[PDB]
Amino acid sequence: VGRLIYTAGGYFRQSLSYLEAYNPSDGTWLRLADLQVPRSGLAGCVVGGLLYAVGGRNNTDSSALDCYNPMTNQWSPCAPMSVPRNRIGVGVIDGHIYAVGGSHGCIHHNSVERYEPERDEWHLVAPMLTRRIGVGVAVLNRLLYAVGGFDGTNRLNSAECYYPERNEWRMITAMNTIRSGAGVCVLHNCIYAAGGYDGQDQLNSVERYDVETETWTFVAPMKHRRSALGITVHQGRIYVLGGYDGHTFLDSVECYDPDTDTWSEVTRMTSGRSGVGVAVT
Ligand SMILES: COc1ccc(S(=O)(=O)N(CC(N)=O)c2ccc(N(CC(N)=O)S(=O)(=O)c3ccc(NC(=O)CCN4CCOCC4)cc3)c3ccccc23)cc1
Q: What residue spans do the Kelch repeats cover?
């Protein structure tokens, strides 16, 4: 009935078609219409109550944008991006979807494009300073942040900031830890970077960046270490969904209370998966 946490796609042995929704009010899961094409490594977002699945890898790298309407339980195709973008990052500014980075085969994108729902059109914006796949994306104060990822040579702890009015990117303070495939979100005016892969291990560490003091501080780590996790914010708490811990595909969903600096496991997906697109509406 209320706002749900949607997880689309993912990987477990193969790319998946599942669209499921979690109700944090009563702990229930709903099963919704499958995606047209199974996809992992995509990103989710919500604009005008519509859920969007962006990019990923098919079953093969995907330029697709698909739109799910919760009121009709239907997926519809949208204008494709100018390039396939697997392991994409996505952020929304003023009802516009920014597709950041990602990979096409062995090409590691630094390009960025902007989708206009009112026109069903994508347009390129200024490219990032760094090529980033597995990049975490966060929107804060009408700025778009691109955090960590892999540039094709090094895994990254750097982060950079896009200025829509200036159409430009600037590097910001780097993270304490290198992170590709982290969950990045915004909670209570800070950017959170949860988990990821530092080049040797999946991580359970979690650091937040305070823009005022422009520094990254560690906070309480998660129970299960994980990369390629889904992440979202619901009612002032962070939810991370699934992922890969180095051996298993997680079905675990942990929830972070910023006021207690605590991670509790609050439910479990119907099956373990990583590389899901996650959004709330
Ligand atoms: C420890 O090694 C790692 C090194 C680095 C990383 S990463 O997080 O930093 N990273 C970015 C980067 N590499 O730069 C990523 C890798 C893979 C992704 N997936 C989708 C996609 N299109 O790539 S995925 O989640 O769905 C997945 C698919 C297969 C496998 N591995 C298997 O063996 C599958 C075979 N299984 C099948 C069932 O069981 C038996 C064996 C594990 C995960 C990512 C998705 C989003 C963001 C980042 C992703 C992660 C792990």
A: 4-49, 50-95, 96-142, 143-189, 190-236, 237-281
For the Cβ of 155 lying below 6 angstroms from any atom of ligand 1, the answer is no
Residue boundaries of the structural domains of the chain:
1-281
Tokens, residue 166:
């200036």
DSSP designation for 74: E
- Residue 11 beta carbon below 6 angstroms from any ligand 1 atom: yes
CA distance 130 to 171: 9
**Residue 269 and residue 147: Cα distance in Å, rounded?**
26
Q: State the structure-solving technique.
A: X-ray
Nearest Cα to Cα of residue 99 among 133, 50, 58, 48: 133
Evaluate: CB of 44 within 6 angstroms of ligand 1.
no
Secondary structure class of 9 (helix, strand, coil): coil
- Say how far apart CA 248 and CA 176 lie, in whole Å: 26
Q: How far is the CA of 36 from the centre of ligand 1 (A)?
A: 22
Measured between alpha carbons, how far apart are the two ends of the chain, in Å? 11
CA of 228 to the centre of ligand 1 (A): 7
Ligand 1 site, residue 242, Cβ cutoff 6 A = no
Is residue 28 helix, strand or coil?
strand
